[PDB]
């Protein structure tokens, strides 16, 4: 009966009543009438026509929508898309949590790009590492003035930037003269670098490694490939 | 300090520390223990924070252990239905094979 009336209601009317309908709990039906982007939106949150919600979003026109929505999407476990929205949002933090949990390089490159974006030094490093990229970690340091720290990495996992880097750090120190403050040596004397001969470089292990990076470590797994990184690793690594 | 420990090419100290801060709660931090590692135990805890078998699967599958994550997931009345890219594809690799150190201890000189 009402439907005959329905033509003979418009804009705003629909809204009020929609709220009534919503009160009725005739959410779907409430959806059908739906009439305000906001109105549609909130209801949409309740409702979850997911795709449908997207169309309403269309171009959302507010990350806040995406943020709100992201939580919702994620709940529905409509991730493929969620990723698209979140990505669309480029809302890195939550998105990272998923991306990381299954794992992914690709995410990492784009993200790397992002990593560059973020404005505090630390996250970006994990990324660089995570990717496996000393190089990236070290380059990053150059901008931030992480210098003592950069040396440790450069030493540990040797890109022998310890030599290069140390000179520069030392130079800062140098600026701030005093001989102790200057501090000096790479192959020999103070440090014996390559003459010490101990644990962050060489070819053979490295060759084995070269491959290693390429295969999946294995134990028993899924399509989501292996790498391990534990006891075993220590042993071969020494070899 | 943990960072120093992972920088260096050795494994325990971070792990006790990991215990002792895991043990001091967490929602975003477990991550620290996992990467340089393969294996994590965090997952036992983690699932409890999540507990949607989702995290548990994503994480799970490779030790050849996707499976328990599914068992619960089913029990619940599952809710997963779509996923995004993420297939383990970034390198947790680097650190210190023989010749050209670590640095537990770092020598220098005033000279």
Numbering used by the authors:
A (entry chain C): 605 to 843
B (entry chain A): 703 to 813
Sentences from the paper on this structure:
Coat protein 1 (COPI) coated vesicles function in retrograde trafficking between the Golgi apparatus and the Endoplasmic Reticulum (ER), and between the Golgi cisternae in both retrograde and anterograde directions. Coatomer (the COPI complex) is a heteroheptameric protein complex, consisting of α, β, β’, γ, δ, ε and ζ subunits. Arf1-GTP recruits the protein complex coatomer from the cytoplasm and anchors it at the membrane.
To further investigate the regulation of Arf1 in the coat, we incubated COPI coated vesicles with ArfGAP1 or ArfGAP2 in the presence of a non-hydrolysable GTP analogue and determined their structures. We were unable to identify any ArfGAP1 bound to vesicles produced in the presence of GTPγS, while in vesicles incubated with ArfGAP2 we identified an additional density near the central γArf1 molecules in a subset of COPI leaves. The size and shape of the additional mass corresponded very well to the catalytic domain of the ArfGAP2 protein, which we fitted into the density. The ArfGAP2 catalytic domain is bound into a niche in the assembled coat formed by Arf1, the γ- and β-COP adaptor subunits, and the β’-COP outer-coat subunit. This suggests a possible proofreading mechanism: ArfGAP2 recruitment, and the resulting GTP-hydrolysis and coat dissociation can only occur once the coat is assembled, minimizing premature dissociation of coatomer from the membrane. We were not able to resolve the C-terminal, non-catalytic part of ArfGAP2, known to be involved in coatomer binding via interactions with the γ-COP appendage domain, most likely because the non-catalytic part of the ArfGAP2 protein is largely disordered and may not form a globular domain that can be positioned at 12 Å resolution.
